[PDB]
Amino acid sequence: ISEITYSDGTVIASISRDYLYFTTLAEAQERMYDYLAQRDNVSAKELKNEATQKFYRDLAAKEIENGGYKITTTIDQKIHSAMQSAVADYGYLLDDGTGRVEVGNVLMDNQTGAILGFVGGRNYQENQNNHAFDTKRSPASTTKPLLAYGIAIDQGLMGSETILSNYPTNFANGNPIMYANSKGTGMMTLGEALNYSWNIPAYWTYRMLRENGVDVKGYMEKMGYEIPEYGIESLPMGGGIEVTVAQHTNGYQTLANNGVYHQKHVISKIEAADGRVVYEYQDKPVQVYSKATATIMQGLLREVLSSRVTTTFKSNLTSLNPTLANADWIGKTGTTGQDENMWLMLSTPRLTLGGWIGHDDNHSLSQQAGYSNNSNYMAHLVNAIQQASPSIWGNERFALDPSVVKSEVLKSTGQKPGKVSVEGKEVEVTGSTVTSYWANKSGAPATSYRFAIGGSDADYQNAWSSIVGSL
Amino acid sequence: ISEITYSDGTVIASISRDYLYFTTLAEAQERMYDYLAQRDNVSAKELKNEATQKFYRDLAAKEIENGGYKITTTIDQKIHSAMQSAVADYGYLLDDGTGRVEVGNVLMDNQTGAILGFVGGRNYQENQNNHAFDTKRSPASTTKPLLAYGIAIDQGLMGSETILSNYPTNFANGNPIMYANSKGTGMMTLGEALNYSWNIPAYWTYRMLRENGVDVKGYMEKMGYEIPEYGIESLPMGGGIEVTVAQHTNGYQTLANNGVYHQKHVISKIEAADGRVVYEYQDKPVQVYSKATATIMQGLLREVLSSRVTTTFKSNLTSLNPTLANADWIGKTGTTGQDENMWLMLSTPRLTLGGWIGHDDNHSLSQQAGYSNNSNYMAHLVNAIQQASPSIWGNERFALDPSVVKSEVLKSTGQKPGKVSVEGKEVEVTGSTVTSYWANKSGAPATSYRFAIGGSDADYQNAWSSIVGSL
Ligand SMILES: *[B-](O)(O)[C@@H](C)NC(=O)c1ccccc1C(C)C
Ligand SMILES: *[B-](O)(O)[C@@H](C)NC(=O)c1ccccc1C(C)C
Ligand SMILES: [Cl-]
Ligand SMILES: [Cl-]
Ligand SMILES: [Cl-]
Ligand SMILES: [Cl-]
Ligand SMILES: [Cl-]
Ligand SMILES: [Cl-]
Ligand SMILES: [Cl-]
Ligand SMILES: [Cl-]
Ligand SMILES: [Cl-]
Ligand SMILES: [Cl-]
Ligand SMILES: [Cl-]
Ligand SMILES: [Cl-]
Ligand SMILES: [Cl-]
Ligand SMILES: [Cl-]
Ligand SMILES: [Cl-]
Numbered sequence: 001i002s003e004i005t006y007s008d009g010t011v012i013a014s015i016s017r018d019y020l021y022f023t024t025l026a027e028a029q030e031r032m033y034d035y036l037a038q039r040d041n042v043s044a045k046e047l048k049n050e051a052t053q054k055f056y057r058d059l060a061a062k063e064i065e066n067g068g069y070k071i072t073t074t075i076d077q078k079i080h081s082a083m084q085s086a087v088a089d090y091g092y093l094l095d096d097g098t099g100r101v102e103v104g105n106v107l108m109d110n111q112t113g114a115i116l117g118f119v120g121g122r123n124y125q126e127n128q129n130n131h132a133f134d135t136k137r138s139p140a141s142t143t144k145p146l147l148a149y150g151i152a153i154d155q156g157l158m159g160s161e162t163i164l165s166n167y168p169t170n171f172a173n174g175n176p177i178m179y180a181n182s183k184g185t186g187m188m189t190l191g192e193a194l195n196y197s198w199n200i201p202a203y204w205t206y207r208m209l210r211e212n213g214v215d216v217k218g219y220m221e222k223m224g225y226e227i228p229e230y231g232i233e234s235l236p237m238g239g240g241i242e243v244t245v246a247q248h249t250n251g252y253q254t255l256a257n258n259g260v261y262h263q264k265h266v267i268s269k270i271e272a273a274d275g276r277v278v279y280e281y282q283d284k285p286v287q288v289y290s291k292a293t294a295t296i297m298q299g300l301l302r303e304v305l306s307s308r309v310t311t312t313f314k315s316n317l318t319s320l321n322p323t324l325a326n327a328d329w330i331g332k333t334g335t336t337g338q339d340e341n342m343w344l345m346l347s348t349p350r351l352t353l354g355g356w357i358g359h360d361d362n363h364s365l366s367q368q369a370g371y372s373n374n375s376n377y378m379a380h381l382v383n384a385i386q387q388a389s390p391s392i393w394g395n396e397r398f399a400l401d402p403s404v405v406k407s408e409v410l411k412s413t414g415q416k417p418g419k420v421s422v423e424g425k426e427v428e429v430t431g432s433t434v435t436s437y438w439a440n441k442s443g444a445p446a447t448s449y450r451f452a453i454g455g456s457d458a459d460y461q462n463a464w465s466s467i468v469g470s471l
Numbered sequence: 472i473s474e475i476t477y478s479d480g481t482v483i484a485s486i487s488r489d490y491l492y493f494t495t496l497a498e499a500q501e502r503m504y505d506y507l508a509q510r511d512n513v514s515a516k517e518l519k520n521e522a523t524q525k526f527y528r529d530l531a532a533k534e535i536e537n538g539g540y541k542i543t544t545t546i547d548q549k550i551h552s553a554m555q556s557a558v559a560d561y562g563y564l565l566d567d568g569t570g571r572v573e574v575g576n577v578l579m580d581n582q583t584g585a586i587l588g589f590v591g592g593r594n595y596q597e598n599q600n601n602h603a604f605d606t607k608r609s610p611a612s613t614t615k616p617l618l619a620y621g622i623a624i625d626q627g628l629m630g631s632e633t634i635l636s637n638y639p640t641n642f643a644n645g646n647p648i649m650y651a652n653s654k655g656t657g658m659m660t661l662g663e664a665l666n667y668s669w670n671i672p673a674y675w676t677y678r679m680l681r682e683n684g685v686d687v688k689g690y691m692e693k694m695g696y697e698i699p700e701y702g703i704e705s706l707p708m709g710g711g712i713e714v715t716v717a718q719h720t721n722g723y724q725t726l727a728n729n730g731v732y733h734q735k736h737v738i739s740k741i742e743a744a745d746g747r748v749v750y751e752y753q754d755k756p757v758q759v760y761s762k763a764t765a766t767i768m769q770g771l772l773r774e775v776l777s778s779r780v781t782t783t784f785k786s787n788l789t790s791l792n793p794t795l796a797n798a799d800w801i802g803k804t805g806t807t808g809q810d811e812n813m814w815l816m817l818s819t820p821r822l823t824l825g826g827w828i829g830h831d832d833n834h835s836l837s838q839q840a841g842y843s844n845n846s847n848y849m850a851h852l853v854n855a856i857q858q859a860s861p862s863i864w865g866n867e868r869f870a871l872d873p874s875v876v877k878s879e880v881l882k883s884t885g886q887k888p889g890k891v892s893v894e895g896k897e898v899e900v901t902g903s904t905v906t907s908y909w910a911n912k913s914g915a916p917a918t919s920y921r922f923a924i925g926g927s928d929a930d931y932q933n934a935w936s937s938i939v940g941s942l
């Protein structure tokens with residue numbers, strides 16, 4: 001008789017009415033499919049044949065049913081059990097007056113990509129859809145650190161105190177770029193752009209990557225993402241990208257693990273009754289962002305949560321478990337256009353926890369669902385995980401890599417002080433300075449007239465007026 | 472032998488090393504002083520004599536020591552005990568890196584003024600100062616609802632959607648009126664002014680009361696406040712006012728109790744061994760604000776907490792005790808200039824809880840001490856009180872009194888739509904409208920050129936540009 005086990009060998013089931021069983025069995029079936037096709041010498045060409053494939057999929061299922069295989073999962077019994085109780089006990093906190101709210105969460109070890117526990121949904125007995133591994137939804141503004149800022153930093157095109165335009169601008173189709181009811185403001189730092197999740201700065205950042213011919217697909221495909229069209233202007237805001245929570249957790253794993261991707265996995269090994277290893281996970285680490293980039297981004301995402309602009313999470317957690325709230329939490333929120341998907345992705349140096357909520361039919365949630373409800377539910381989820389496994393989150397801090405370049409830059413421009421051409425006239429740009437972190441060799445450039453990411457001529461005239469005002 | 476008892480007759484002590492004992496004994500001694508002086512026929516003139524007074528104070532103390540009196544306090548044993556445990560267990564949450572932080576809290580029944588429990592300090596054994604009844608500190612911005620907005624509303628000079636200037640302006644001594652580093656912004660609603668605790672709108676509101684000769688002292692002295700100089704421009708920001716937490720709790724009691732003051736008290740009765748009532752509390756309710764005013768202010772203070780701009784309290788509480796967080800909480804925060812005193816005053820229809828923190832030597836706290844630390848500690852305190860006495864906060868809602876006048880007003884002006892003189896030119900002021908609540912007879916006036924509370928000529932030019940821009 002075949003068994004699926006937790007990470008410590010405790011049997012989950014013989015080959016039963018929950019996500020854990022069907023998720024791990026589906027994945028073990030897929031690994032058995034690959035093993036049996038390779039064993040029978042069936043080529044990837046032969047496997048293109050629809051009837052041969054159907055047969056091999058059936059053979060795989062039956063082989064587990066009838067064999068005596070042991071399937072070792074990465075799942076930590078105590079932790080995953082605590083996560084189930086947390087959703088059973090506190091899932092109702094998600095209900096925001098837009099009907100029953102669905103949820104998915106994946107908890108992943110940053111150093112291995114192992115999935116220690118997950119939440120598939122509110123209640124498998126009422127709704128079987130698996131929101132952790134099956135349902136794909138736009139990751140909304142949580143795309144910004146990975147595909148816009150992280151890449152721009154990694155390419156030496158931005159530092160931590162770089163200024164970006166948030167002046168009003170339009171998309172290619174002529175529509176204004178919006179952030180709720182705001183058509184935009186003026187210049188702002190990268191930290192302010194992240195903390196608020198403004199949209200225009202991320203639009204400009206990605207425009208810059210396109211203009212510069214940056215291989216964005218290279219980064220994203222190294223983390224396992226599949227995006228059909230990389231020219232989409234709203235990609236940083238989650239346009240043109242749909243992901244599972246387990247996949248997206250893996251992108252935040254990469255940033256938390258100092259830029260080093262490990263592939264997510266729930267199966268570590270499948271053995272025959274006699275011990276023959278028929279499948280084993282093989283770690284293939286990839287340095288997707290430099291250590292400088294990742295560690296700079298960790299410092300920025302720490303402030304996203306502490307600032308409490310887009311999520312109440314740190315307030316909810318400091319109440320529930322003040323000691324755990326003092327662990328080194330970093331994270332990012334997302335909200336889709338009509339409030340159809342809310343995300344909160346969280347990490348400590350040891351673990352990453354992804355969280356989505358939304359409705360199976362894509363109807364809107366309430367305006368506050370992601371800011372407050374999901375934050376409060378995820379604070380309960382994190383507490384429950386720590387209650388189950390007291391050291392699992394860890395007490396380590398994220399810290400800048402030694403390879404980070406520190407540049408003294410003007411607050412106003414985010415570039416080094418120097419002379420600048422303004423309206424036909426050299427001007428000595430002077431004033432108060434801040435340390436800005438870079439991931440290139442030479443750090444920040446000298447200040448130039450177009451000192452910010454993005455902006456029209458009119459925007460710069462308005463901005464320079466204001467700076468020159470200060471000198 | 473004389474005994475001090477809790478409200479249900481359970482003996483607190485015979486006439487011992489805590490705030491409860493010394494507070495209730497000091498107050499019983501003062502009531503015994505009045506009783507003995509009156510019994511011995513000593514006139515208030517004779518009582519002016521310093522030696523006669525010293526003798527009567529001693530006689531009072533000894534009379535309790537030696538007599539067999541029963542002193543019934545208002546203190547609820549379970550609740551006050553829970554409050555002591557809360558401070559013992561969670562007072563450390565107040566420590567913000569500016570040294571040990573001291574604290575006072577008073578919990579009061581809104582319908583009676585009875586004090587059900589209080590916190591004197593972190594630990595009587597280490598520091599005896601009584602921060603609930605003895606120490607007087609500026610109430611900072613918590614003065615605003617009572618002495619500026621509440622009065623202006625009560626006088627028919629403002630409604631709930633009235634617009635106030637927050638344009639830069641100076642105090643009489645020429646210094647800018649500040650709100651952290653901001654010299655101000657532009658026009659704003661009363662709700663925005665309250666939620667953020669901006670200072671310039673409260674300065675203008677109180678200026679208007681002065682200009683109009685409003686008897687502000689009348690209101691404040693009806694609630695037991697003692698303020699030496701009512702001409703102080705910064706009175707709404709806590710300048711020129713110092714209060715105990717028990718006194719200040721009583722002003723918020725008045726607003727929560729639909730405008731009806733009841734005097735705070737910790738002693739309800741003192742009897743002789745033979746049953747002779749030597750002192751009994753006599754309730755003297757006073758309608759300090761109309762029911763319309765108070766109920767309008769409750770709606771505004773509800774949004775102060777929900778908006779989470781100046782306090783994380785509702786996030787801390789919704790995590791700890793989601794059901795209790797759904798009770799009808801209203802409140803206001805305060806912070807003195809150098810971050811020397813932080814306040815959070817909270818009410819449900821049944822109870823009011825005042826909370827101060829600061830340092831005994833008036834050194835600064837951290838910038839976030841009142842926003843986060845005191846909010847998290849008070850969320851724990853409120854939870855502990857509900858755990859001890861499950862119905863004590865109640866599930867009632869605050870609601871507008873029927874006598875409230877509802878006016879349809881322009882969002883831009885907070886006054887009714889109509890023709891206005893702009894730069895020599897009649898203009899039809901049109902646009903979107905909101906319901907505004909008033910406490911007078913006729914509701915809001917028609918829009919006038921100076922539509923807001925306060926503002927210079929230049930401010931109105933800038934404001935009207937912008938409104939006329941919209942039509
Ligand atoms: B991102 O999800 O923060 C970003 C693209 N979201 C929005 O612009 C958005 C969509 C609907 C409601 C609110 C918001 C922002 C987060 C205010
Ligand atoms: B009131 O206490 O909110 C108001 C008068 N406080 C301040 O202006 C102040 C003083 C020091 C630090 C911050 C602040 C405000 C609350 C930002
Ligand atoms: Cl499943
Ligand atoms: Cl499960
Ligand atoms: Cl076979
Ligand atoms: Cl395990
Ligand atoms: Cl669009
Ligand atoms: Cl690309
Ligand atoms: Cl993907
Ligand atoms: Cl492309
Ligand atoms: Cl797997
Ligand atoms: Cl075998
Ligand atoms: Cl590197
Ligand atoms: Cl924080
Ligand atoms: Cl918050
Ligand atoms: Cl649905
Ligand atoms: Cl005392």
Ligand SMILES: [Cl-]
Binds near residue numbers: 489491492591
């Ligand atoms: Cl006590």
Ligand SMILES: [Cl-]
């Ligand atoms: Cl006597």
Ligand SMILES: [Cl-]
Binds near residue numbers: 480546
């Ligand atoms: Cl009692």
Ligand SMILES: [Cl-]
Binds near residue numbers: 642644646
């Ligand atoms: Cl001043």
Ligand SMILES: [Cl-]
Binds near residue numbers: 701
């Ligand atoms: Cl007066």
Ligand SMILES: [Cl-]
Binds near residue numbers: 695
């Ligand atoms: Cl007073």
Ligand SMILES: [Cl-]
Binds near residue numbers: 700701702
């Ligand atoms: Cl006066």
Ligand SMILES: [Cl-]
Binds near residue numbers: 498735736737738
């Ligand atoms: Cl009393």
Ligand SMILES: [Cl-]
Binds near residue numbers: 539743744746
């Ligand atoms: Cl007697």
Ligand SMILES: [Cl-]
Binds near residue numbers: 758763
């Ligand atoms: Cl009345």
Ligand SMILES: [Cl-]
Binds near residue numbers: 785
């Ligand atoms: Cl709320």
Ligand SMILES: [Cl-]
Binds near residue numbers: 834
């Ligand atoms: Cl001190």
Ligand code: NA
Binds near residue numbers: 197333
């Ligand atoms: Na967001």
Ligand code: NA
Binds near residue numbers: 804806
């Ligand atoms: Na305040």
